[PDB]
């Protein structure tokens, strides 16, 4: 473990004098109650107003 949830392990050398390392991370996301998350959809970002 380097950082919590991430690890680095040495694997060996592959007859070409090249070493390899394995870097792995495990993660997930949990929602305890349905009313803790909401999404607003269809948001246009290319509209502009005029000031005369």
């Amino acid at each position: 473990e380097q950082a919590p949830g991430l690890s680095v392990r040495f694997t060996g050398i592959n007859r070409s004098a090249i070493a390899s390392y394995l870097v792995t991370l495990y993660t997930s996301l949990a929602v305890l109650t349905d009313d803790a998350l909401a999404v607003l959809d269809g948001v246009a970002v290319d509209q502009f107003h005029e000031y005369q």
């Binding site: 007859r15 070409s16 004098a17 090249i18």
Partner: protein
């Protein structure tokens, strides 16, 4: 000294078959040679002889 009257001389066979790689310039990612050192299966053995009277 010889502990029990027998002396065995172990020798390497085919020293020219050990392969080494040396680069002249601009090293690459080519595979390296794989080798080992071989021994003689019937080495010469010396046993002490007596001079007595």
């Amino acid at each position: 000294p010889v502990e029990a009257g027998i002396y065995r001389v172990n020798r390497v066979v085919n020293p020219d078959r050990v392969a080494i790689h040396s680069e002249a310039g601009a090293g690459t990612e080519e595979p390296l040679p794989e080798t080992y050192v071989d021994y003689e299966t019937h080495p010469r053995e010396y046993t002490l002889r007596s001079i007595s009277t």
